[PDB]
Symmetry: C2
Subunit: 253 residues, 2 copies
């Protein structure tokens, strides 16, 4: 049976995906397709390009997050540079099905609200577009479309993975926790909260489509902030432990 | 004769078109038995429910001083509060909104939970103010321990609320919520607002798809009308009036 891996969108919490990967390889579970949004697209796409979970863990641990003309523009440039540098070996690739593992990334066309699925082109640019959280990174233009992260239209792209032809999906949902009324002090917070609501709705809808055979992994991440990169060890381990406890069920694949 | 609910969709400047609708509705002798509204729909609808005539609403709108990738309003909230409080001095606080001249409901979003919050009692100016709390324009307001923004993102076209007021038929005014073009998205604020516009359109269409035969959708022709373009109040009001005049035959079938 063909196994697809769906990595949900997010920021810091998405580092938990590394853990999941580390556990999957440890259990000898072969992935035939990967679909991701934002940090799910980053981790999943780097993995799909040929990186090992150990390498991704190392990269995450040695990364200077705090460090990485409008601020969103600058940070967008930095994002692009880091991704391009990490994915230099895919320079001559154009077909995402021809990566080490077939890959899809998800963005939102900010002009129309349409879901945009990347299956071809330049992998670092697709990942960057999918990672382009509003108010953190400036929108990216690809093929005449202005694109932001896919979170607001398809944060958990189960059906994208299924469209890649797999029979079963392993779905990792890192969650998108709402803020308390004490953490909604500024306009930015209100806007971001609205986006969070949107994201949660489409995420719930996609999760409702899971069927017998599919495996849902929800790493224990209560208390972890969206921009909390000071706890990378715990983030990775949370994803790892949540997948390890399911080894009995995963083994049936 | 059936009980008629009026549903006034949310927005800002475009919401003034509601006045036109009202002007036509009264002119055709259509009795409204209940009103449910969001943001400007709640402002126009709420003022109307408190006894203001469409002519008076038009006069108010016409004489109002509305003037009060790049990176990105408590005072605005205070002034909105002031104008609403002034217009509604004939109603007290601690009042049942079903006891207004026309039963009224206003819709807001609990920004902490994302839950819909429907006002059916209390201080009318405060409820309308909450419903009008558009993020990035008006600071959120606190009511009964809840932090509230406008209801657009959860229930921009509150049809089921109107039905919950026990009406048989609804007249539903969708003044629309247009997306900005790619070329018009310049600030981060623009992007955020665009996303809000998207979720607003989603819930709006979900509610609109529930309209039954007998109900009547009125969709005013507001194609090129900016969401905060208060420089064309006459045109705005006329659009609502024209739209309701065109559907006169469908609406006549209500009474």
């Amino acid at each position: 049976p063909k196994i697809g891996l769906v990595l949900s969108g997010g920021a810091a919490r998405g580092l938990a995906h590394i853990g999941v990967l580390k556990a999957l390889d440890e259990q000898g579970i072969q992935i035939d397709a990967i679909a991701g949004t934002s940090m799910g697209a980053v981790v999943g796409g780097l993995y799909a390009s040929g990186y090992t979970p150990a390498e991704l863990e190392r990269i995450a641990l040695e990364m200077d997050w705090q460090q990485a003309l409008p601020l969103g523009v600058i940070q967008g440039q930095n994002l692009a540079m880091v991704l391009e540098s990490l994915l230099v070996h895919t320079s001559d690739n154009r077909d995402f099905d021809k990566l080490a593992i077939p890959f899809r990334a998800v963005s939102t066309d900010i002009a129309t609200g349409e879901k945009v699925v990347f299956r071809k082109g330049h992998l670092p640019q697709a990942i960057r577009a999918s990672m382009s959280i509003p108010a953190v990174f400036a929108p990216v233009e690809i093929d005449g479309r202005l694109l932001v992260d896919g979170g607001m239209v398809d944060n958990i792209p189960v059906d994208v993975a299924r469209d890649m032809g797999v029979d079963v999906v392993i779905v990792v949902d890192i969650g998108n926790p709402l803020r308390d009324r004490k953490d909604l002090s500024t306009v930015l917070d209100v806007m971001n909260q609205s986006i969070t609501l949107m994201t949660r709705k489409n995420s719930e809808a996609q999760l409702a489509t899971l069927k017998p055979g599919d495996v849902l992994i929800q790493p224990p991440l209560s208390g972890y902030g969206t921009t909390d990169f000071g706890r990378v060890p715990q983030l990775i381990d949370a994803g790892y432990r949540a997948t390890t406890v399911l080894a009995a069920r995963l083994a049936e694949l």
